[PDB]
């Protein structure tokens, strides 16, 4: 078998990130929110999607016609997105729930967010894929989402989601996110490495 | 024209239009039409404009050219086995026949009597060309006997004696034996010279000495070929100038003994050659073959056969051309004999006119063998046909 170079790079990077010792700030992203709660998170998030580019123009031209003939509204409620915008919201202590993508490509973009969210007192969760967050906000990718205000109808729903994240993500893991990650080896890998280690330690010290 | 109540054929008949069901196959036929439209290859032709195929045949005009060997009227019986070969005397009154039984029967053509019942397997038998020397050479296995029956005039026996009086030579109810010639192989076919001084013997088993030439004047035998290639099926002599014709398994070879050289090799293009016959003019040859084919060769046309004829349902056994009348016959194991008319014109422009004349039938077939040999009458269009059941049919 002869894999292409880019396919070989992909799979080696997968194994390499496992064998190495991942620091606690980077290993906490290996432990994401469970599948049930993530579904409930995105149910609430999909009631606050920002309006589409067509739907916004549809609304604006509707109001433009009214003034063109002859002529006050409510504050829009939606989900907050954008790394700089969300980080500014967390430092402002305005965010109620921060949802960090688990595979942001340069990981240091989000590596401080769990600590910043815990410093400011914001309930946060790490959810799977940057594309699920992107889907909510009509983008291809969202490194992080945040909820600051919801309608009075969904105040009780958000209070249930926040408790579930607290019970299933923060109360859980917790100590597991303070431990260096990695070093995971296959079923037969330690035995092979033990033979290699004892052979090397015998006389192969140069 | 198929409907509820059509008289054309009786699909189904319906007493009324209301009772008529819905054709459940209609979608299938329409679907097949769709598939035919864009999947069935379309070939363009000349639409074969209205032209009955009866215009293809030419005019043979048999009503003019009709020397008809009509239906047989004389049946000769008494032979208990297959009549392997039969021959007619130059005078045309005597017909000598023989077969595997070893019984030689001489029949009088006009009366049908078997006057000479003396038996004396029979490979073949041929009369001498000389009327005053009616010597019949009969082949039995590897031995050929020059028999002069006493039925002829007494002086003719003496006339035949002085003709002779490799192969070894030796000199009974009228068993007048004159010369017995023995050969290493079992001779298949016999041929006689025009003057009667030469006898040609052909055997298929042998390769080096398949064919032997016997000269009665010196009373000896020899092999005409220094090196013979291929099996030999039959041999004959040219009836006009001295050429020797060898009918091999595949080819027909013409050899001039005067120069001891090859003349022409006719390619029959046939898996197996059965027998050959020569027109009296000598420039036309008729070849019977085991491939159920008759090949007409014109020596002045080409080495390839002039025409090919493939009507016989079984292997063509024997072919014979009438010495005087422009007719010839072909007998096969199918039990049917094809009688054709071949008119030969000495003019260069006029190609030979070969047309069928009759298809004789009603001959018994035994052990996949029907007609074995056919002979032409020296005077008129009369045919002697030998069957596997011992029946000799005289087709007048």
């Amino acid at each position: 078998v002869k894999w292409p170079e880019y396919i070989r790079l992909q799979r080696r990077r997968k194994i390499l990130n496992l064998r190495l010792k991942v620091p606690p700030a980077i290993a906490q992203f290996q432990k994401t929110l469970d599948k049930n709660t993530a579904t409930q998170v995105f149910k609430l998030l999909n009631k606050y999607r920002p309006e589409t580019a067509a739907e916004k123009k549809q609304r604006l031209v509707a109001e433009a016609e009214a003034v063109a003939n002859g002529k006050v509204s409510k504050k829009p409620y939606n989900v907050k997105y954008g790394l700089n915008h969300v980080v500014a919201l967390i430092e402002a202590k305005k965010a109620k729930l921060v949802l960090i993508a688990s595979d942001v490509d340069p990981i240091e973009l989000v590596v401080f967010l769990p600590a910043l969210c815990k410093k400011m007192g914001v309930p946060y969760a790490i959810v799977k894929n940057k594309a699920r967050l992107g889907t909510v906000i009509h983008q291809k990718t969202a490194a992080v989402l945040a909820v600051t205000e919801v309608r009075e109808e969904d105040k009780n729903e958000l209070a249930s989601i926040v408790s579930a994240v607290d019970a299933n993500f923060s109360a859980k893991y917790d100590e597991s996110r303070r431990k260096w990650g990695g070093g995971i080896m296959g079923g037969k890998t330690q035995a092979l490495l033990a033979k290699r280690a004892k052979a090397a330690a015998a006389t192969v010290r140069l | 024209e198929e409907s509820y109540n059509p008289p054309e054929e009786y699909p189904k008949k319906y007493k009324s239009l209301r009772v008529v069901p819905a054709y459940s196959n209609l979608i299938k036929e329409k679907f097949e039409r769709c598939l035919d439209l864009y999947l069935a290859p379309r070939v363009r032709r000349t639409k074969l404009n209205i032209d009955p195929e009866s215009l293809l045949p030419k005019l043979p005009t048999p009503s003019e050219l009709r020397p008809f060997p009509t239906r047989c009227t004389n049946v000769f019986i008494g032979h208990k086995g297959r009549v392997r070969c039969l021959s007619v005397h130059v005078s045309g009154n005597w017909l000598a026949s023989g077969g595997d039984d070893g019984v030689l029967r001489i029949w009088e053509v006009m009366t049908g009597r078997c006057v000479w019942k003396c038996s004396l397997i029979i490979q073949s038998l041929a009369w001498g060309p000389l009327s005053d020397s009616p010597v019949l050479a009969v082949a039995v296995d590897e031995t050929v006997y020059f028999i002069t029956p006493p039925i002829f005039s007494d002086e003719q026996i003496e006339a035949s004696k002085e003709l002779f009086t490799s192969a070894i030579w030796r000199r009974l109810h009228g068993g007048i034996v004159h010369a017995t010639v023995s050969t290493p192989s079992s001779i298949k076919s016999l041929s006689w010279h025009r003057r009667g001084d030469y006898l040609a013997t052909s055997s298929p088993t042998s390769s080096s000495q398949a064919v032997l030439i016997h000269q009665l004047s010196r009373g000896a035998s020899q092999s005409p070929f220094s090196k013979s290639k291929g099996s030999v099926q039959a041999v004959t002599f040219h009836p006009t100038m001295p050429y020797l014709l060898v009918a091999t398994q595949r080819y027909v070879r013409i050899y001039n003994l005067v120069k001891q050289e090859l003349v022409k090799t006719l390619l029959t293009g046939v898996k197996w050659v059965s027998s050959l016959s020569v027109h009296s003019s000598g420039d036309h040859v008729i070849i019977g073959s085991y491939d159920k084919r008759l090949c007409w060769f014109d020596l002045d046309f080409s080495s390839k056969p002039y025409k090919n004829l493939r009507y016989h349902s079984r292997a063509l056994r024997d072919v014979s051309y009438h010495p005087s009348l422009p007719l010839f016959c072909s007998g096969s194991d199918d039990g049917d004999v094809q009688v054709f008319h071949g008119r030969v014109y000495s003019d260069l422009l006029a190609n030979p006119l070969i047309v069928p004349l009759k298809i004789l039938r009603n001959h018994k077939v035994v052990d996949n063998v029907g007609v074995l040999s056919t002979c032409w009458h020296p005077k008129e269009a009369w045919l002697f046909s030998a069957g596997a059941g011992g029946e000799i049919r005289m087709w007048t």
Partner: protein
């Protein structure tokens, strides 16, 4: 010069295989077939298949390379690719949970017009009129079939409209000539602009799809024929001066008026002209209305067969009352009761038929197919031996290719059919 490489020209260069045609067009089989349906393309077998197949012998279908090269520059092919792009954008829209953007994508779905396909396939209107019968056969077949998940409801609606418009034209122009009844359905034969049109209409019954026919193929043929019929009907209505398309009466269609819903407002053809036929509730109105109005006869029908009936049951103006039911309790007078075969026999023969012989409960005269022509010797329902054999066994004896062998089928089949139907009259006379 150079040594010419074997098989670099001739049949090997003129003919192309199906697989090589696929890779040349960069098409898939489903799309290559679909463009072959719309265009006029078909397999062509060469005289020397082995030579055309580069010396191979596997059974392989062949196409003209010039036919394939003509498909390289087809604007429809780019419409097949645009549909693939749109289908993927629709998938992404729904998979991302954007219902409204999916609706917008569906509205701007790429559609293509078959204008240039018809022009390049049929240059002149008479060429279209020649191969219009196959289209009419299919549109009528599918105008009565139930809607499937394969073939849409819009396609069925268009087939009914196009079929009804064509029937309206034939009735208006009296171009119908013959109408024949068979077990398959009703064979109609009309003449338009000199050309002859023959199609088949099945009986309306609750059939079942055979489930063995590929309805994807039916989809492209329906699409091609509907475009072909639309432009043909447009010209025919312009020729008559009628505005195209005729308006559709929604209320009449909602009441199943049939042809009566479409009103053709302007922008022996009189065999039944002086007659007012009536239709009972046991007869194929979809067929009887067509023929009678085409030949001038006025039509009234039972209310349950469709609204818009100009006549009632009790109207005494009825000349004939077609009714296939063997029992009529409320028998009228002056409205002589006949069977449906009476009308169609009259159409085929161009003359009025025997109402007494076709009266209710009577025997039914045999049906004559007008399409069947009288043969050389076929039965219409309404000393020598020696010369003969010699003249018959010489071509099979001497002729080179024995092309005379065709008699073994031309004369044999005709004689066997002639002998059968000639002896049939002897059998039926003996039975009588």
């Amino acid at each position: 010069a150079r040594v010419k490489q074997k098989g670099k020209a001739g049949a090997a260069r003129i003919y192309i295989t199906r697989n090589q045609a696929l890779k040349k067009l960069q098409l898939t089989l489903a799309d290559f077939r679909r463009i072959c349906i719309l265009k006029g393309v078909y397999p062509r077998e060469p005289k020397n298949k082995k030579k055309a197949n580069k010396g191979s012998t596997a059974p392989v279908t062949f196409y003209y390379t010039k036919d394939i090269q003509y498909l390289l520059h087809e604007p429809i092919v780019q419409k097949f690719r645009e549909y693939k792009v749109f289908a993927r954008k629709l998938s992404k829209a729904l998979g991302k949970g954007e219902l409204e953007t999916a609706k917008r994508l569906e509205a701007r779905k790429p559609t293509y017009s078959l204008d240039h396909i018809i022009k390049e396939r049929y240059p002149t209107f008479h060429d279209a009129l020649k191969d219009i019968d196959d289209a009419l056969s299919m549109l009528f077949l599918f105008s009565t079939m139930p809607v499937t998940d394969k073939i849409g409801a819009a396609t069925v609606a268009n087939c009914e409209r196009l079929c009804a418009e064509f029937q309206h034209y034939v009735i208006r122009s009296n171009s119908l000539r013959k109408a024949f009844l068979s077990i398959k359905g009703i064979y109609y034969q009309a003449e338009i602009f000199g050309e002859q049109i023959t199609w088949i209409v099945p009986y309306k019954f609750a059939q079942s799809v055979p489930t063995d026919v590929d309805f994807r193929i039916m989809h492209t043929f329906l699409e091609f024929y509907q475009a072909l019929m639309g432009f043909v009907n447009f010209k025919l209505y312009n020729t008559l001066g009628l505005r195209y398309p005729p308006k559709i009466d929604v209320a009449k269609s909602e009441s199943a008026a049939g042809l009566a819903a479409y009103e053709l407002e302007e922008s022996n053809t009189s065999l039944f002209s002086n007659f007012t036929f009536f239709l009972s509730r046991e007869v194929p109105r979809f067929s009887l209305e067509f023929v009678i109005r085409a030949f001038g006869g006025k039509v009234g029908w039972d209310p349950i067969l469709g609204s818009g009936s100009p006549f009632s049951e009790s109207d005494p103006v009825i000349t004939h009352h077609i009714c296939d039911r063997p029992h009529i309790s409320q028998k009228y007078e002056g409205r002589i009761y006949i069977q449906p075969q009476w009308v169609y026999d009259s159409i085929n023969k161009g003359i009025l038929e025997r109402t007494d012989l076709y009266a209710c409960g009577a025997t039914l005269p045999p049906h004559l197919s007008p399409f069947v022509k009288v043969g050389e010797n076929d039965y219409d329902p309404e000393a020598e031996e020696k010369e003969e054999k010699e003249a018959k066994e010489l071509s099979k004896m001497m002729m080179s290719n024995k092309q005379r062998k065709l008699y073994s089928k031309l004369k044999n089949e005709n004689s066997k059919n002639e002998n059968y139907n000639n002896a049939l009259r002897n059998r039926k006379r003996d039975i009588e």
